[PDB]
């Protein structure tokens, strides 16, 4: 995740030539990145955030896949396991 | 006793608590009553809307300890369904009748017994101290009969007669009386 | 007592040997029937129904008797839950232990060859002190229990209530063969 | 007794608690049964621990106790008053003797009782035996009277009453319903739902 | 007592030393035979049959005796389960301990050289109070047990019932050699 | 009693609440002073010195008294180890509990407002049976202890030995304010 | 008692007795009972399995106990292949002295200030009931008495007549006297 | 009692009870009466520590009123046998066999805290003296042999004559740390 931070945001990648191992300088500023995956443990986090509640008298107790993913926020992805620096570089969550 | 482990590994009672089943087994004491309260509080938060199943197999016990359960049952948002297993006597019958109306159950061969309280504490010391404790016991007696009469949709006068001496009831008699709503078979 | 630990192959899971046998749907009632020992049986019966409502539960009984109300919590749980509860007598099934043995699913009540089964009317379900009015009440409750137990026994055994009333008057000891002929068990296991 | 185990949900994993440790995580401290050096020190340890977890959030002190040692109850009492967070007190079942004292010692406006709870206040009994010589008995009688006055004075402060009222009312066991305790000044509110 | 922990090489698994020996199909009956100690033996015998129905089970006995019904739960389990149960006497096998020793698979009943084996008629299987009618019943049940134990002993030892009736009249102490000659054990181990 | 478990944030570590407070350098002396309870205090005082010799140790006292030799093991450990041991009276500090309270680092001896502090001459440090020669020996040892405790108390309180001899003759109960004026504590905490 | 925990480097956490069992040290401490004797047997059997050739070190600090329980240890010691070396710590009295003398000849040790006591057995069980029952139990006790003296005499390379004299009443011996008698082979110092 | 748990920092973390943590530092406690069980734990710890490091000192902290002689002798012989020096420290009290084991520490490494109490005395019953006069004679003789053995070993520890220990152990002889140092039971008194 840390290594990708500077590849997704504009850097100059130094990659081997078309032959066997002078390297090529590639400006990644305008390369569009689409990342994705099945964040299998992500629904539990969203439910923990949206249905916190409390235990005991004075406190008040709160009511209890498609719906949960549709309300995902960076707070969930951070608790899931992505780093804030990478989440902010993926501004559009579909 | 060795409490079996079932599959995270639970002891079988923690496993049943996960299903919202709370057991009151044996005498009602400060310690056994506070565990019921702790479980009732815990379950309300895990889900304020789902029913809690309070399984009772108890000969009775302390009134104040039973009242801590009783007030917790009435306070928490989720309905507390009560089931009589084996027996519900004295405060056990009180807590059985205290379940949510329409959700008070008994098993077919269970035994339900209601009676006026005994000593809530000794009556020693001076006649002035004995007077005080006698008055407190009478207030408790009236409070329990009044709450029982409310639970059973009966007159206070009926509970005063019927709790004078140990009144044993079958599940059918308890249903007719108004202590339980249904008798389970299968 | 030290309860041995056994390893289940699946990875591995370590169990005490009784939790291991519960995994095989074996529930033990050993020693006197008390509120605590009866509620563990009930908890295990409820748990096993949830795990598999269709598979048989094996209820191994080695008990001298105990509380009637505690035994009735087991009895009603056995009859309520969907899966058949097969009962096996090991060593002895006396008093409420014999009642729960006979309460197993008809056709699935077993005894080992040298087991001892004893049926009898109940003793004190609780003391009879206080005033003659209190003693009358407790005597009446004990008689109702006596009749209830004989009636349920007679149902289990396919016998007349009059037969159980005679036979439970005093401690009635039976071999596994006599219990089979009586109607308390269906089969005697050998191998 | 077997204390149930409950599972707390965190990120992608679960912490197993006994149900009382789980409720301590919610800032609920129980005082159940007699007040002893050991049961009082657990309350103190929990109160100290909770202050550090969050000095600003309220602590909920659930009381179901017939009474107990005065010195043990005073260790709780001074800890309640010392620590920064308000200690809300709730009466379950009963709050008698030092249990009623600690109930009344909760933060003013946050002292609660359940509807059918029983609250009893009374002068102290023996804080320790009075044997030995008449000189020793005199000393212990004087110490007991000082404690008696201290408890009535602190009770009167809690209840916004005159010391003379507490001296009358604690002469013999004074049992109160939650409503009577509210009118007296031992609690502020009665919970229903 | 503190039960030592031992490590099994496989990764590693930590056992208490008795669970480690159960892994080798060794079941101990140590001290009095009670419902609880007998049911652990039964649980272990059942467990070991499931692990391997064909391999022998080694049942080490160091017991002064105990309950007959508890001992019979072990006895019937030993005879029921498919694998042979070899029995070994350590220290002593007295009363039901001697019965269970003799109950081992014929040819696989062992004793250590300085062990002590004692056979005798049963004592009280329960008190004999109440009315003369109750005492008659319990006396009859005790006599039936007495005959059953002598009959099963005689079968184990390849002796006449009349021989066991003489020899169990009073406490009959035997060396390992005398027990071998009698027919209670098959071999005496040395090394 | 069930000792609550608390979680320390660091990963996470689960502690019992007393081990959690030991991590904050808080040592409790609760109830009677015995060889076992005194040695735990010593073990904790030693352990904390090694963790950080410069940081203060907080010794919370709620004790009616106890053995003198057990209290002296704490006392000498408090004085020996490099870090200052601050003492706090909760509920009560009586007899050796008051001694250990006064033994805290001067300027760091505290009491809560409603705590009770009691000082008195020692009672039996052990029975005085046997022969008059044995009774003489034990009476002499008790007097030496009495003088030692009054002398150390007088040192702690900046008072004359004659004052402690008067004041410890019979149970001398003090409020936190009286203990401060006497010289047993330095400050009274409120918030 | 709280049994300390120690860490073995290989890490594995042991209680200190399980750690010493890993080094083939078996303790018999206090009275010999069915339960304490069966733990010794379980440990002896376990150690033979781990290594049939290496010596087992059986540390004895015991006032005595049951004869049948002690005989379960004794027969296990003699049966298993590895030599069982015995060491007396503090005391080895009655069956404790018997098991001490039962160690492998040449490997029976005592510490310098240990106390070793040999004596005829006491009640192996009460002698109530009828005179016929008392006769039986008296005969069994005499057979045990003779068996123990005979095995002791074998251990010590002495005549049965010597053990019969010397075990008549409690016979206390220093480590040196036990060595001269034949109960132990060596006395350890460093 | 609840024994606190402490965390050791290493190369990771290991959780110990506080006594196992102190054993890791070669500290062995003898607290309360000397029994077969408490003495065998000391022996097990002494044996374990010798193996961990045969050259480093072992610190044997004693707070004990006394106890069984045979149990104390199992500790005593283990202390003398194992290669590493066993330093002894008196906390609170070292009485009877506790004083014996205190004096049994390595010469030059026997310590006491300033307000500790050290008491030496002849043994009491090592076991009852019932039965027949012949049995009582035997047990009386064994007790006298133990009495002489303890006085002889004490005299050796203290660099005193056997006659001095026989006088001084006749009745309970209580000593301050200073008196024990002058007597020869300890070498130094710790302050800071």
mmCIF file of C-alpha atoms in Angstrom, chain D residues 13 54 81 85 99 107 112 119 132 143 149 172:
data_model
loop_
_atom_site.group_PDB
_atom_site.id
_atom_site.type_symbol
_atom_site.label_atom_id
_atom_site.label_comp_id
_atom_site.label_asym_id
_atom_site.label_seq_id
_atom_site.Cartn_x
_atom_site.Cartn_y
_atom_site.Cartn_z
ATOM 1 C CA UNK D 13 -11.832 -9.976 15.373
ATOM 2 C CA UNK D 54 -11.693 8.707 30.522
ATOM 3 C CA UNK D 81 -15.550 11.984 45.636
ATOM 4 C CA UNK D 85 -15.633 11.794 36.605
ATOM 5 C CA UNK D 99 -25.043 0.585 50.728
ATOM 6 C CA UNK D 107 -23.287 12.771 42.156
ATOM 7 C CA UNK D 112 -31.149 6.589 40.873
ATOM 8 C CA UNK D 119 -33.404 1.624 50.716
ATOM 9 C CA UNK D 132 -11.100 -5.876 77.262
ATOM 10 C CA UNK D 143 -14.894 5.852 68.298
ATOM 11 C CA UNK D 149 -21.911 11.434 63.973
ATOM 12 C CA UNK D 172 -33.656 2.449 64.186
#
